[PDB]
Amino acid sequence: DARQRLKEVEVDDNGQFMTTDFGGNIEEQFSLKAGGRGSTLLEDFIFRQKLQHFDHERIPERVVHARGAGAHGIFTSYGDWSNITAASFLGAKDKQTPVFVRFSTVAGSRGSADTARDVHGFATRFYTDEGNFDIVGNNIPVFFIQDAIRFPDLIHSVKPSPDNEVPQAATAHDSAWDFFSSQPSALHTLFWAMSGNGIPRSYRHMDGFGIHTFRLVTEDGKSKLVKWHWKTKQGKAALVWEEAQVLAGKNADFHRQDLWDAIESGNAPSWELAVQLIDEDKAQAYGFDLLDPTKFLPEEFAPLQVLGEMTLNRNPMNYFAETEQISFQPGHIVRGVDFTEDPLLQGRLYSYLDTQLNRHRGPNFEQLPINRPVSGVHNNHRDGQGQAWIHKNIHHYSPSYLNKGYPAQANQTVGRGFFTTPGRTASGVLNRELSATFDDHYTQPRLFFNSLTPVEQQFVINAIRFEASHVTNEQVKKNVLEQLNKISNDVAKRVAVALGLEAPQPDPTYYHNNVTRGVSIFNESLPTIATLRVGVLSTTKGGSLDKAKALKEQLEKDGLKVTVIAEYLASGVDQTYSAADATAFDAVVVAEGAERVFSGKGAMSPLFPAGRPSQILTDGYRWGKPVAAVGSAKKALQSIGVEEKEAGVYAGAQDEVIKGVEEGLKVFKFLERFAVDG
Amino acid sequence: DARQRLKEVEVDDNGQFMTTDFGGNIEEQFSLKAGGRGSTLLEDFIFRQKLQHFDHERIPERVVHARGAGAHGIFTSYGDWSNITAASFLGAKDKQTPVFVRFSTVAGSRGSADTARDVHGFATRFYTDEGNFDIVGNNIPVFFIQDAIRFPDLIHSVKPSPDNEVPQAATAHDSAWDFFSSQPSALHTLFWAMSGNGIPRSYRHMDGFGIHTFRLVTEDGKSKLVKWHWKTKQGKAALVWEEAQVLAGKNADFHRQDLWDAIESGNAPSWELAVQLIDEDKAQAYGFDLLDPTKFLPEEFAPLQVLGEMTLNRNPMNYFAETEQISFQPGHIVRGVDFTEDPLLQGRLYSYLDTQLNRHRGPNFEQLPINRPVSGVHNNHRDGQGQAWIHKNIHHYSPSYLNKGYPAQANQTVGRGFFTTPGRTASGVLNRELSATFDDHYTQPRLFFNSLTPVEQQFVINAIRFEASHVTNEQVKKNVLEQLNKISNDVAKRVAVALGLEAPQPDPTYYHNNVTRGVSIFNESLPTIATLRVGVLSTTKGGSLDKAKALKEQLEKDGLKVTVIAEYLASGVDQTYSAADATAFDAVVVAEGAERVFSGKGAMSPLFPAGRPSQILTDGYRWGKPVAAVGSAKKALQSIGVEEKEAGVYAGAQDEVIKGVEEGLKVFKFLERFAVDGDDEE
Ligand code: HEM
Ligand code: HEM
């Protein structure tokens, strides 16, 4: 049980009488009053201690990545990696380390929708036996900016306009595209956010990245540059925008519920931890600077090497105490890992320690159960708001004769202390500049775009078309096109169409046709369809429900999560048409007999909004899902102009429908249903 | 200009060089580094001061009503009301007082959707010349619970489950309905939240209520019991649930955008302030106890008396400094007004002062520009975090010979001080009980349901069906039915159908057929269509766009906000099909020629999602909006099976369509398009 250490702070209230926070049994359903219809008394200590606690429940949300959810798990090392790192959690084959992971969007406040288009956070804590090590990563391998000092500019520009606080959880507004075009470094991450990575099917269907080049350091001080990757065992999968939008309203909790359900159902998600490892002398060898976080390292130059696997298999018991309070920091580093001179990383180190002071309102946040390491804390820190321990050492300073030298200094040679990479040097003048090696903002955006499938490329174009069309300022829109043109004239032209502008002439400076692997989502089928969701459209009239129940049982055999939908909650029915929507499902299947709710009297029940069943089937099809109908239910497909010969559309007997749907769910999205320019 | 007083703290950065927060011009686009590809230096004071400010930007959201938006405006008294109150802001005809109003939902966090189903906040500050007076109201006249001590219970049950923090901004889950059924006083507000009040078309189309009985007190100490009402001059209007859901996704900012736009466009919204006035000796004379916040006073017993009007005409300059930071309190009271022994109001007084300490992390939040009164602060308060003043009086205590008696005591007869209603008395034993007069939890929910139109009643039932069907626990659903049945056997029967439960046996103790005016939304057409939105569906091909532009100009004459939609942003086009949705508009009109995008090739384009023009027209129709088509565009209506002669459907020449659409917009929703229980029987 990854959560074991937390059991000692769990509080069970079952079978108990109500109390105040300072003990003593009470009742707290009536205010104390002066007379039957009298005023409430100030001496009502019960009322006040209860309302004061309530009044003060809220803490500031994260300044970024406010919207998110997490779970506990276990990371298992596949080997003794002492040849590349001194890091203890990687020191032995099969060595296990508890983890907690939080996934998130970036721009939106708490309560914003999971399926907004955004970069996503993928933050992992390893509670190692040598301290907490966090990889605070995203689901996209590059970031918008090259120097941490520019972070408030980026974030201000993306978050809501400061006059009216519009729009929520969206880059689709003037200030964001003003920034993207004024600060061209941003174009690469922008392309990723405009691809499927911006609207993932779930947290479980994302890869993860540390983004920055870090260093692995061995006991003897030897170093390697490293990129951290998390490779999803569930496969990458993305929504389509028009679906993400409806889902944002129909279930803002889509991703957090998905993770929760997967874990509760015993379908814990896994990711392999992989690294790219390159020598120090490669820092500038690949046509860009590895200190530049707006670039990724093509796998063709340095393949992924798998180090282990983490599985998330325990949900939190209290979301606030665990998920909300957890405080990640890239400065949570351990022996065997070191930083690089990445100027984005450099400033994060400051920011994440400082921000906790805001969010936790005091300096002792590492003492919160979710933040505590498992490995022991021994130092001369004292006091501070909410000090939860009682220190025994009264000689809280070093050096000292009186404490006999304890706690003692640890370094590279004694006590397994942290140490900076011995070979690192500094040379040159102090400066407020960036290396000219950071200057190319367009080659990699082109590389990424090149590496997507034709429809996948169209999604990127259509996302930009959608977003930029919201920009009211004409010149910003032209500025955007000028910058896009530097990446691809074709991209610029196709976007320009939507904006009713003329794209600039070709500017071939950065154009090229190279491609790289591992960045596409839609070029590969899913490795498993376990946990995927099938909505079975039925009806309470006739024999449909019994067949739907039979269909459900067979589908659940293949690890699928099945929802039988009908007009009302009859025996066997999981959800009403009123409550159902296609966004909730990876596949939509009309049970035989249910055609009766697609036309005629059966389709006009006051029990659901007009057209509801047809809409679900229509949405499912247009959004590229496998859709099917059993037996006579094929009339339902006919009612919406859909034909059986189409890819990802299935009809016939129950056996045949199940087989096709299950194969279709591996394809996941049927891209033949989306038009491409030309 | 209601914001005039705020000008002194406004900061203009145009034409200036960048500085630190302690002055000194700087650059702050590059971190200071030890060498060309070097590590960042700790001595980079510029970096740290910039990022420290960024790092500490957020403050806690409000514990309830975290999601909302506000505006500045002016309140004008219609007369000298000194005959009923000593309140200075009501003391002369035409007297003007600056106001700020924040509207909100309740359950959802910041960032949740404006069109979630929920009670809505309607909080108004009057910056009077005798201190700040806040009416902290909602858009529904009754509250869930009868004693403030139960607030954390209600709120906890309605907010997301504490294990996984699901669901956001919704009562549609087990714990909420467990609470509603375990604590039946909640049933009244529940019915209102399940009506159109739960899903208003905008903040501008809501009424407002103080909910509690308060007291108006004259100079001589005579009091009357009072209910505060805000009556929208824009008329009440609501969405349908299936619409509100899509809108939550398509535009989470729908309501804050609507208010912002109305104000920017010079279409400031207004509400009349009205009161019901009750004799003290009639507190329990109307079939319930006026100290009970779960009850409203039927207007048949005590009609609304209009005292004045408030108009919101200025948007904020900085949302955070103004809207987010403003701190309302029902304890913000002034001479001429007093509290009552309403046990819910009673505890609010404590909670709103205390909670500011959490949100603002300090005791000086009244010093923030948006919280400051216009009338002057003089007392012996000192220090505290963030103290923004420098006090001159060194004898900061009373009584005192050394300060000559200043600041001096003010009371009823001296210095126009606040005073508690002199006639108020306490009688009886100290108790942790509620008056038996509070016992009836079903009569008024029944009264409210009786007072809605048939389709309006259907909306309530369908909302309950939708919500309750989310409850996983079977006993909880049965508990809910047992409670609904105490209100109305037919309601429980109709809801039971959805849940697959047996229609309960009548339990007539509280049943009655009484009706009251002023609670329906749909039984009345809008007084104005100004600001309402028309989506004109057009095309870049052919002559459609030119005709669309003409249609637009005429519509705009009648005060409408018109969006011309096409495949891409050609000249005259306001929005692409890709970016458009029916939820954005109050009416949808297909411009002549646009029928080409409803079928065949024109409907197949990489520029928008398959079926988008059709989906917009379909949604508009199904959600009860006025829909229309000019000339040949009638083919678009045909394509979605809509007959040209239905109510709320307009087809013909440009002139006729404009006429019909403008007429339909006053009706606003065409309720004939919604099935009522029994309709589908053979
Ligand atoms: C490679 C670039 C970056 C990545 C991958 C990244 C990732 C993340 C993630 C995943 C979180 C959410 C952690 C959680 O779930 O609690 C987060 C939060 C945060 N980030 Fe970053 N971020 C990056 C750049 C930056 C920069 C440049 C800054 C400032 C210099 C910054 C400052 C912050 C702050 C202040 C928080 C809030 C932390 C808290 O409140 O606990 N980030 N970031
Ligand atoms: C008639 C019943 C009630 C009404 C009409 C009401 C209305 C409101 C409104 C409109 C707001 C948001 C104000 C804004 O826009 O900033 C609010 C916030 C709040 N309410 Fe109430 N409420 C009621 C009951 C209660 C009760 C019984 C309590 C606790 C005893 C309570 C505690 C709070 C708190 C702590 C806030 C946050 C205030 C802040 O953070 O500034 N409310 N309420």
Q: What is the DSSP string of B229-269?
A: EEEETT---B--HHHHHHHHHH-TTHHHHHHHHHHHTT---
Check whether B352 is labelled as a binding-site residue.
yes
Asked if B650 and B555 sit in the same domain, the reply is yes
> How far apart, in whole angstroms, are the C-alpha atoms of residue B367 and residue B625?
47
Cis omega before residue B407 (within 30°)? yes
* DSSP one-letter code for B364: -
Q: To probe the interface with B, which of A51, A476, A490, A670 has the most B CB atoms within 10 Å?
A: A51
Chains A & B: contacts with CB separation below 8 Å? 429
- Residue contact A163–B316, C-beta within 8 A: yes
Distance (Å) from CA A64 to ligand 1 centroid: 7
- For chain B, give the number of residues: 682
Q: SS3 of B519, please?
A: coil
Under an 8 A CB cutoff, do A607 and B465 touch?
yes
Residues in a beta bridge with A103: A69, A122
Residue type, B514: N
Alpha helices in A500-644 (DSSP H): 544-557, 612-622, 634-639
Query: Amino acid letter at A551?
Result: L
The beta strand positions in A233-358, using DSSP E, are 270-278, 305-314, 337-338
**For ligand 1, what atom is nearest to the CA of residue A122?**
10
Residue to substitute from A40, A240, A493, A581, interface B, most B β-carbons within 10 A: A40
Q: How far apart are CA A599 and CA A164, in angstroms?
A: 45
CB contact under 8 A, B469 and A34: no
Cross-chain CB nearest to B242 (options A28, A69, A609):
A609
Q: The CATH number of the domain where A178 resides is what?
A: 2.40.180.10
- Which residues of chain A have a CB within 8 Å of the CB of B318? 162-163
Instruction: Using alpha carbons, select from B234, B247, B167, B172 the residue that is nearest to residue B207.
Output: B234
Out of A316, A351, A435, name the one closest to residue B55 (CB). Answer: A351
Quickly tell me which residue has 């404009």 as its tokens. B658
CA distance A31 to chain B (A): 6
Say yes or no: A485 and A538 in one domain.
no
Nearest to A163 among B113, B319, B570 (CB): B319
For residue B262, what are the domain limits?
A: 1-430
B470 is catalytic: no
How many domains are contained in chain B?
A: 3
The CATH number linked to B479 is: 1.20.1370.20
Q: How far is CA A201 from CA A662, B2, B68, in A?
A: 17, 48, 30
Nearest ligand to the CA of A64 is 1
Among A103, A328, A350, A359, which residue has the most ligand 1 atoms within 8 Å of its CB, making it the best to mutate? A328
The structure tokens listed for A442 are 């367009």
The C-alpha angle with vertex A119 and arms to A114 and A121, in degrees rounded to 5, equals 75
The CATH number of residue B619's host domain is 3.40.50.880
Say whether B354 and A167 touch across the interface (CB within 8 A). no
- Same domain assignment for residues B258 and B399: yes
Q: Give the 3-state secondary structure percentages of chain A, helix then strand then coil, rounded to 5.
A: 30, 15, 50
Three-state DSSP class for residue B652: strand
How close A352 comes to chain B (CA, Å)? 8
d(CA B250, CA B222): 53
**CB-count exposure of residue A233 (10 Å: 0-12, 13-18, 19+):** middle
Closest CA to B240 of B455, B73, B94: B455
B610 and A604 in contact by Cβ < 8 A?
Answer: no
- Pairing type for strands B337-338 and B430-431 reads unpaired
- Closest CA in chain B for residue A317: B163
Inter-chain residue contact B350 with A573, CB threshold 8 Å: no
CA of B170 to the centre of ligand 1 (A): 29
Residues of A in contact with B430 (CB under 8 A): 32-35, 41
Together in a domain, A371 and A483? no
A253 to chain B, closest Cα gap in Å: 6
Catalytic residue selected from B72, B120, B132, B138: B138
Instruction: Please tell me if the CB atom of residue A135 comes closer than 6 angstroms to any atom of ligand 1.
Output: no
Identify all chain B residues contacting A31, using CB atoms and an 8 Å cutoff.
147-149, 343, 346-347, 432
Ligand 2: does its nearest atom lie under 6 Å from the Cβ of B351?
yes
With 0-12 / 13-18 / 19 or more C-beta atoms within 10 angstroms meaning exposed / middle / buried, residue B472 is exposed
Residue matched to tokens 């002139």: B655
**Rounded Cα distance, A340 and B39, in Å:** 8
Q: Are A138 and A130 in contact (CB under 8 A)?
A: no
Question: SS in 3 state form for B78-104?
Answer: CCCCCCCCCCHHHCCCCCEEEEEEEEE
Tell me which of A20, A58, A240, A257 to substitute to probe the interface with B (most B C-beta atoms closer than 10 Å): A58
Last residue in a domain, options B492, B509, B528: B528
Closest-CA residue to B580 (of B566, B561, B595): B566
Torsion of CA B25, B28, B34, B39, to 10 degrees: 150
Q: CB burial class (10 A; 0-12, 13-18, 19+) of residue B167? A: buried
Resolution attained, angstroms: 1.9
B27 contacts A54? CB cut-off 8 A: no
User: Which residue out of A47, A49, A54, A55 has the highest number of ligand 2 atoms within 8 Å of its CB and is therefore the one to mutate?
Assistant: A55
Residue where a domain stops, chosen among B474, B495, B528: B528
Please indicate, yes or no, whether residues B511 and B552 belong to a single structural domain of this protein: no
**B672 and B544 within one domain:** yes
Q: Where on the phi/psi map is residue A15: left (φ > 0), alpha (ψ -120 to 50), or beta?
A: left
C-alpha to C-alpha distance for A443 and A298, rounded to whole angstroms: 13
Residue B651 pairs with which residues in a beta bridge? B629
Question: Following CA atoms A606, A611, A614, A616 in sequence, which dihedral angle do they give, to the nearest 10 degrees?
Answer: -80
A454 and A578 within one domain: no
Indicate which technique resolved this structure. Answer: X-ray
Cα A604 to ligand 1 centre (Å) = 50
Whether the link from the prior residue into A167 is cis, omega within 30° of 0, is: yes
Amino acid residing at A9: V
Residues facing B200 on adjacent strands: B238
Q: Nearest-CA distance from B280 to chain A in Å? A: 14
The answer on B521 and B594 residing in a single domain is: no
CA B467 to chain CA centroid, Å, is 21
Q: Which residues contact B255 (CB under 8 A, 6 or more apart)?
A: B69, B103, B114, B115, B200, B202, B203
Q: How far is the CA of A532 from the centre of ligand 1 (A)?
A: 31
Residue A508 burial by Cβ neighbours in a 10 Å radius (0-12, 13-18, 19+): exposed
With H, G, I as helix, E, B as strand and everything else as coil, classify residue B203.
helix
- Whether B502 and B554 have beta carbons less than 8 Å apart is answered as no
Dihedral, CA of residue A408, residue A412, residue A418 and residue A421, to nearest 10: 150
Q: How many CA atoms lie within 13 A of B658 on its CB side?
A: 17
Last residue of a domain, one of B396, B430, B464: B430
Quick one: closest CA in B to A471, which residue? B575
Q: Ligand 2 centroid vs B437 CA: distance in angstroms?
A: 25
Kindly give the distance from the C-alpha atom of residue A122 to the centroid of ligand 1, in angstroms, as a whole number.
Answer: 10
Nearest CA in chain A to B62: A58
From the CA of B94, how far away is ligand 2's center (Å)? 31
Backbone angles phi, psi at A522, to 5 degrees: -80, 0
Q: Which residues of A are catalytic?
A: 65, 138
Q: Which residues of A fall within a CB distance of 8 Å from B38?
A: 341, 426-428, 431
Q: Examine the domain organization and report whether B565 and B482 are in the same domain.
A: no
d(CA B635, CA B629): 8
B545 and B419 share one domain? no
Whether A206 and A103 have beta carbons less than 8 Å apart is answered as yes
* Ligand 1: nearest atom to the Cα of B55: 35
Residue A458, classed as helix, strand or coil, is helix
Q: How many CB atoms lie within 10 A of CB A218?
A: 16
Among B420, B435, B438, residue whose Cα is nearest residue B215: B420
Q: Which residues contact B222 (CB under 8 A, 6 or more apart)?
A: none
Rounded Cα distance between A108 and A165, Å, is 11
Q: Is the CB of B125 under 6 A from ligand 2?
A: no
Q: How far is CA A293 from CA A134, A195, A227, A520, B624, in A?
A: 18, 19, 11, 20, 51
Same domain flag for B349 and B495: no
CA-nearest residue for atom 25, ligand 2, is B348
How close A666 gets to chain B, by Cα (Å)?
A: 23
Residues of chain A positioned with their CB less than 8 A from the CB of B435: 36-37
Q: How close A363 comes to chain B (CA, Å)?
A: 14
**Same domain flag for B198 and B237:** yes
